[PDB]
Design a protein around this ligand. Structure first.
Ligand SMILES: NC(=O)c1ccc[n+]([C@@H]2O[C@H](COP(=O)([O-])OP(=O)(O)OC[C@H]3O[C@@H](n4cnc5c(N)ncnc54)[C@H](O)[C@@H]3O)[C@@H](O)[C@H]2O)c1
Ligand SMILES: NC(=O)c1ccc[n+]([C@@H]2O[C@H](COP(=O)([O-])OP(=O)(O)OC[C@H]3O[C@@H](n4cnc5c(N)ncnc54)[C@H](O)[C@@H]3O)[C@@H](O)[C@H]2O)c1
Ligand SMILES: NC(=O)c1ccc[n+]([C@@H]2O[C@H](COP(=O)([O-])OP(=O)(O)OC[C@H]3O[C@@H](n4cnc5c(N)ncnc54)[C@H](O)[C@@H]3O)[C@@H](O)[C@H]2O)c1
Ligand SMILES: NC(=O)c1ccc[n+]([C@@H]2O[C@H](COP(=O)([O-])OP(=O)(O)OC[C@H]3O[C@@H](n4cnc5c(N)ncnc54)[C@H](O)[C@@H]3O)[C@@H](O)[C@H]2O)c1
Ligand SMILES: CCc1cc(O)c(Oc2ccc([N+](=O)[O-])cc2Cl)cc1F
Ligand SMILES: CCc1cc(O)c(Oc2ccc([N+](=O)[O-])cc2Cl)cc1F
Ligand SMILES: CCc1cc(O)c(Oc2ccc([N+](=O)[O-])cc2Cl)cc1F
Ligand SMILES: CCc1cc(O)c(Oc2ccc([N+](=O)[O-])cc2Cl)cc1F
Lengths: 257, 257, 257, 257
């Protein structure tokens, strides 16, 4: 495949419906060797199962809230891999209040801090900790959503955080690009993942993009996965600082009228 | 003037070159009554002078790092004003490291947190604390910069924070808009303010927009001020969730070639 | 007013609901002297009435399909006015087929040509013919719509034409900016004008932005007019190459979900 | 490869440095069968050579200025191919005057008409003529440039035309998407093609993106080609109405300062 020999670390694989799952499958299919992170010892066995699914026994703890775990993640990976060619950042969190109902009602200094810490800061944080072992053609990929660009109901503080995340893509691209490293995001359409249970009225968004997107269909983790594999590969050698929509074209319309 | 009888609170007036100074002058010129905030008792007298300059004796402490000062700000203002028609958010900060040289070198969890806390969170925080006394036609205005949209050298972590700030404009507009309140930003071009001493190679950016902007000239606080007064006024009744460039058109070109 | 002594030529005033009507009223209110164009002798008397409404007896024929009328327009104006400070381009047309139903069904080389000729070319064409008599602080303004940025049902070929029009704003700004002349567009929300009778399901768009815009209300020609007056004035001295949304913030949301 | 069995028609292959050449190579490499168009009998033999290079004897005349040639193109192709899976639109033209020096100096009704006719109209025109034989998973791809989004020196009227072209991508995506067909553009960085000899100071743009792009290098037709192959493939099943930058990230920075 077009990722033959590429070694890629994936965060955020929580279930078989996770976006990271779809990316993992496409990457493995195209020849990559994979490693995975998880959060909390309670989940080690589940991720080891998932990892086995993709021919991997490389799983490491990483709570991105903790500097020590971020550094220890790459120290551990480094015992197995001399170089890292790909990093998939598929991680996000905000307190339920901060993504329910009215934007201001859920706004507190702490809710803001946590959302931005986990959902935005963590991406350039992992990039920085990974840097010493990044191959010169490495590719860093994060996941965003249209709520970064336009106000979407309930998304609220996550929208602010995703806006900072997309900006981080641009600044990381400049910082790491001289070396040859690329940094991109996929702005994915809604997909029924575990995280989607967080978003109130996820169902309504889903119906709405099915009915209004140019392709008149929702995207799948297979589609987001294949797009991700492309960006992580040398096929996308000329692409950096890009936020690529993989959402059936929904971002490009005004729907519902 | 077109702000006759409007009552407007301005943050961020640090000197006579501050963007807030220019906005204040244009607002006063157009008939507004003004109030001002300041940071630290060491600065109370300077701001009282500035305020006197605009026919005001209404100055209040507000360090946006402190929830208690934010709430006390509007409690105090409320003893003088029954309603608030305008709020100017002209406040920003990042640790010098986070805006010098390479993006990653200056990246730390704490530098990130502080930049976003002060430069982004503070805007919807003030909006929320002001809400009870906002008139139905009130207008909230913040200041951003092109580094939010595109990577600019040295701007670094401030770029991430300004990206979150512009997103906050959109979500605030939805939250406060039913009531009739508008929320906008001006993305201003470079202006030799005290804050600009922070940015390394501010001089180079300045020369570059003078030479490459369509108007072949840098903007002034008078120009940004007049634009701000417009947005704060009923003239801009149909305008919300907008990031308006007041930068001699520089954002719209690719210059230097 | 803030347009005291400015002399401004307005195209596209077809009725008292025209966007140009609202702009004219705001400009006159702020002190401008106005002149108007019309299309076809059949309409001379109606426009003279409208013009009288704003204290003007300056009306001139200009079908923008005809080079000769464009040049004769400014030759005639020049007999009355030594200089021109403002130009309002509020003109658009596509064959009904090209804006009904499916984009491709209405697509023909000729429909395309006409839409772009009238709706896009005409703006920089008038700018070029006006140039010799433009004051150094003159301001050129055109009207666009969100269909330029995102696909909207039925808008079709007009969307392509408005995209070219907004690009023309940027290139005109660079061409005319050295001299000091500014060039901008207002992307207006839907307004029940005569032109709106063209757009099938204008009613549905109208309801939809009322229900989904942050301000939960449609814009008025008074609002678009005041925004236009601002851009045409020295208040907007720092603003060029800008497409300003005056649409109750609708562009900034994803609505209907 | 990931285009196994896909049948793809490419326009605009003029030389071995053409962007279409690079796309053709990547498509053939990934398993596609190709067909080609050319302009003028004088060029039939050159394109037959090029086509032989990619294992093809399918070459057809198509001057996009001529409706009859557009329809005859697909009638002819249809004698060889039952279905069409991919279309590459890599065609552009403006009179030299319209892309030299000042935007207005080169502006004439005819120069405008020709640029938009050839560079924009031709894309949805080919899509419409191809429609009856398009497979349900077909993918249409056109080539654009950053001058569509921001004013670039000399690009002038081509910038207006490319703006209309990118809009056409969005409207075509909605029109053809119900069927399942995708429509996208690649906004490519500068590449020393025959067409680039048109652009005055192409050399300066080239140096400038090498020095300022995040990757600090210019893109190649190999890079644009691989990106194109991806978009034309089922790998990009979730991607439509997208303008993908393949320009070393240059669009995402403000350079030169
Ligand atoms: N699901 C969607 O519709 C969607 C759409 C667009 C964009 N995005 C984004 O895709 C990414 C992946 O989410 P998903 O949809 O696959 O849901 P998911 O629940 O399957 O994955 C989310 C991941 O976030 C991780 N996470 C949360 N806090 C963490 C922490 N402190 N440290 C490390 N990891 C942490 C979880 O472990 C989980 O694996 C997210 O960034 C999300 O915002 C998702
Ligand atoms: N100066 C520029 O070129 C420029 C350009 C574009 C955008 N912007 C922005 O304009 C706004 C105003 O900055 P300026 O250029 O007028 O410089 P300035 O130094 O005159 O104003 C900055 C203000 O930030 C305030 N501030 C910092 N920390 C604070 C805190 N914890 N609590 C309350 N206030 C605090 C300062 O008191 C000061 O008044 C900023 O948001 C800046 O990012 C500035
Ligand atoms: N009405 C809306 O909702 C709306 C919304 C957004 C943007 N825009 C735009 O605002 C502008 C004004 O339209 P309107 O809404 O006020 O409708 P309108 O019918 O009142 O004005 C349209 C004008 O186009 C003029 N026109 C058409 N062909 C012409 C030609 N060959 N030469 C000279 N003039 C010609 C007409 O004379 C008319 O005055 C248009 O550009 C329209 O696209 C309109
Ligand atoms: N070369 C670049 O740097 C560059 C950069 C960004 C975007 N784009 C675009 O890429 C596309 C391809 O151009 P290129 O760079 O490969 O140069 P090119 O000269 O190799 O290809 C241009 C093609 O335009 C075709 N063409 C012109 N008029 C035609 C007509 N009437 N009918 C049919 N075909 C016609 C030519 O035959 C030629 O094959 C163009 O659309 C160009 O605008 C090019
Ligand atoms: C609306 C589509 C959508 C967008 C997303 O960013 C998304 O991911 C998350 C959403 C919320 C949280 N949280 O609050 O903990 C975490 C994540 Cl990872 C899921 C989605 F369904
Ligand atoms: C480059 C133009 C420019 C943009 C700005 O946002 C700006 O404002 C600040 C910049 C840095 C800090 N700080 O680090 O504390 C604070 C502020 Cl308020 C000044 C500028 F000169
Ligand atoms: C949908 C909102 C909207 C957008 C517009 O541009 C608009 O103006 C026109 C629309 C169509 C034609 N025509 O085909 O002749 C002309 C004009 Cl001037 C009206 C609108 F109601
Ligand atoms: C500046 C980079 C660049 C952009 C392009 O669109 C490009 O293609 C063309 C440019 C001009 C013409 N013409 O006038 O005939 C035709 C084409 Cl196909 C070439 C480029 F070098």
């Amino acid at each position: 495949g077009f990722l033959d020999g590429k070694r890629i670390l994936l965060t955020g694989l929580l279930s078989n419906r996770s976006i990271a799952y779809g990316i993992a499958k496409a990457c493995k299919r195209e020849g990559a060797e994979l490693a995975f992170t998880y959060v909390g010892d309670r989940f080690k066995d589940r991720i080891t199962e998932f990892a086995a699914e993709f021919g991997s026994e490389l799983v490491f703890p990483c709570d991105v809230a903790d500097d020590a775990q971020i550094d220890a993640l790459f120290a551990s990976l480094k015992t197995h891999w001399d170089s890292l060619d790909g990093l998939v950042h598929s991680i996000g969190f905000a307190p339920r209040e901060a993504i329910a109902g009215d934007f201001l009602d859920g706004l507190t200094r702490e809710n803001f801090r946590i959302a931005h810490d986990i959902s935005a800061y963590s991406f350039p944080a992992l990039a920085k900790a990974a840097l010493p072992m990044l191959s010169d053609d490495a590719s860093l990929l994060t996941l965003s959503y249209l709520g970064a660009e336009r106000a979407i109901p309930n998304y609220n503080t996550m929208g602010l955080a995703k806006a900072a995340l997309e900006a981080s893509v641009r600044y990381l691209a400049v910082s790491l690009g001289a070396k040859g490293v690329r940094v991109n995001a996929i702005s994915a359409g809604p997909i029924k993942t575990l995280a989607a249970s967080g978003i109130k009225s996820f169902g309504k968004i889903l119906d709405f993009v099915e009915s209004n997107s140019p392709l008149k269909r929702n995207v799948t983790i297979e589609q987001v996965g294949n797009a991700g594999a492309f960006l992580l590969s040398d096929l996308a050698s000329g692409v950096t600082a890009e936020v690529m929509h993989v959402d059936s074209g929904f971002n490009a319309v005004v729907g519902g009228m």
